[PDB]
């Protein structure tokens, strides 16, 4: 059971208004044939245009919602909407474009999917809430066949050119007119009562319905993301590396060790309450402090209510010492806390748009993160940048310019001039810090945190 069998049954009830008289008994094989495509018993890596919900989840970076509305059916114009917010109008003769023939519309479709997906995926997955016109319009911009490679590189082919008779990936498709071997999945097959809007609005209040096709394409993908990542969480699915994943993760660990280590030296808390990931380790292994752990998985729907984590009878007194919420998203953090919170609004190849203000962060694993909320940090302040090091001034073993900085908290800086070793390490730490902030993470600390208290930890 690797791929979706073409002999699987397709429920056609959702198609009978755009297609009256459609047989209740239908398979993917007959559906594809009816869409105008011929699969000629092909054993060439493209067994079916439609994929399983499990194959869709592994390829979430490829998801593009797609909906077609009737403006007036070969005689009338179609409005093509995509989850990118783009609406094109095809004539058979919320960015809204006027009516144009299919030969120019298909050129724009290749450009849009290529620029949207080149740094996300090796393919496209059209996420549908199928009513009929979107399947019957696919023959005008899609060509299928055996799996292929790009003419300019080794990636798989996602586009085709009728001008040159060649194939290309999303990076080399400039001037290409057809979508080659796309994938698709009908959300309506998953068994739902009622229309798209009623089901979307039960969980999401951020995407409204301006009745245009892109609005429905957006609600469709949002509902698919909710069903696969909000209410169903699977942290056993690995995702390919497509960016700075390894640098971001390493940076996050360095920043965590640094920030926690300095808070324990500056304020000398007797106990630390580590609230979060049940697999967590002490980030500052050699610290003096009484380290106590509390398990809480990454919340994917709503942020944890602090009353349900801390109350209902552990030291019991979370008000003693400091609380560490490293990626443990709560509605309101206590005043005595150190916090790392992912900002869902961040623009990046790792952060995909999500459900109800949330976002889908895909870094080795997929984590739907709830909406960023500035009100959760009322009792805290933003943690400013600083580099602390109590290690010795010793070079050992890269060209140099002297470092002058008020945030290089070291004996060498205290004593007048920063040494080469702490200048190299300071600059590296600032690069890891910038990587982490730019990736979307935000740091917050208790109001009494002051780096001035770190100078007396050198005598
Ligand atoms: C953009 C990017 C970068 C590196 C690897 C991939 C990938 O997963 N492929 C299977 C090609 C992608 C899509
Ligand atoms: Zn290529
Ligand atoms: Zn939504
Ligand atoms: Zn030094």
Curated annotation (Swiss-Prot):
This is Guanine-N7 methyltransferase nsp14. Zn(2+) 16 binds at residues 393, 412, 419, 422. Residues 239-459 form the N7-MTase domain. Interacts (via N-terminus) with DDX1. Interacts with nsp10. It comes from the Viruses. It comes from Severe acute respiratory syndrome coronavirus 2 (2019-nCoV). Zn(2+) 14 binds at residues 150, 153, 169, 172. Zn(2+) 15 binds at residues 200, 204, 207, 222. Mg(2+) 2 binds at residues 69, 211, 216. The lineage of its organism: Viruses, Riboviria, Orthornavirae, Pisuviricota, Pisoniviricetes. S-adenosyl-L-methionine binds at residues 274-280. Residues 49-230 form the ExoN domain.
């Amino acid at each position: 059971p690797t791929h979706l069998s073409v002999d699987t049954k397709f429920k056609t009830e959702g198609l009978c208004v755009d297609i009256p008289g459609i047989p209740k008994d239908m398979t993917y094989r007959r559906l594809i044939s009816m869409m105008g495509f011929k699969m000629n018993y092909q054993v060439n890596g493209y067994p079916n245009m439609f994929i399983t919900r499990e194959e869709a989840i592994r390829h979430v970076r490829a998801w593009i919602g797609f909906d077609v509305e009737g403006c007036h059916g070969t005689n009338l114009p179609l409005q093509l909407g995509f989850s990118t917010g783009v609406n094109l109008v095809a004539v058979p003769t919320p960015l809204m474009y006027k009516g144009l023939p299919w030969n120019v519309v298909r050129i724009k479709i290749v450009q849009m999917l290529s620029d949207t997906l080149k740094n996300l995926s090796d393919r496209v997955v059209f996420v549908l809430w199928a009513h009929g016109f979107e399947l019957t319009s696919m023959k005008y911009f899609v060509k299928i066949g055996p799996e292929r490679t790009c003419c300019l590189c080794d990636r798989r082919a996602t586009c085709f050119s009728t001008a040159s008779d060649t194939y290309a990936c999303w990076h080399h498709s400039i001037g290409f007119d057809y979508v080659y071997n796309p994938f698709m999945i009908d959300v309506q097959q998953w068994g739902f009562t009622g229309n798209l809007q009623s089901n979307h609005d039960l969980y999401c209040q951020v995407h409204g319905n301006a009745h245009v096709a892109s609005c429905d394409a957006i609600m469709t993908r949002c509902l698919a993301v909710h069903e696969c990542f909000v209410k169903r969480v699977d942290w056993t699915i690995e995702y390919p590396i497509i960016g700075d994943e390894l640098k971001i993760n390493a940076a996050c660990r360095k920043v965590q060790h640094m920030v926690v280590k300095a808070a324990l030296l500056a304020d000398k808390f007797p106990v630390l309450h580590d609230i979060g990931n049940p697999k967590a380790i002490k980030c500052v292994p050699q610290a003096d402090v009484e380290w106590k752990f509390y398990d809480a998985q990454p919340c994917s729907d709503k942020a944890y209510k602090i009353e349900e984590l801390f109350y209902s009878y552990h030291s019991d007194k979370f008000t003693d010492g400091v609380c560490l919420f490293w990626n443990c998203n709560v509605d309101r953090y206590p005043a005595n806390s150190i916090v790392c919170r992912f900002d869902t609004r961040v623009l990046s190849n790792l952060n995909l748009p999500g459900c109800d203000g949330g976002s889908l962060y895909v870094n080795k694993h997929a984590f739907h993160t709830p909406a960023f909320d500035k009100s959760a940090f009322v009792n805290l302040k933003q943690l400013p940048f600083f580099y602390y090091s109590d290690s010795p001034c010793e070079s050992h073993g890269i060209d140099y310019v002297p470092l002058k900085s008020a945030t290089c908290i070291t004996r060498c800086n205290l004593g007048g001039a920063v040494c080469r070793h702490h200048a190299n390490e300071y600059r590296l730490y600032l690069d890891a810090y910038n990587m982490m902030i730019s990736a979307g993470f935000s740091l917050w600390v208790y109001k009494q945190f002051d780096t001035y208290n770190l100078w007396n930890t050198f005598t």
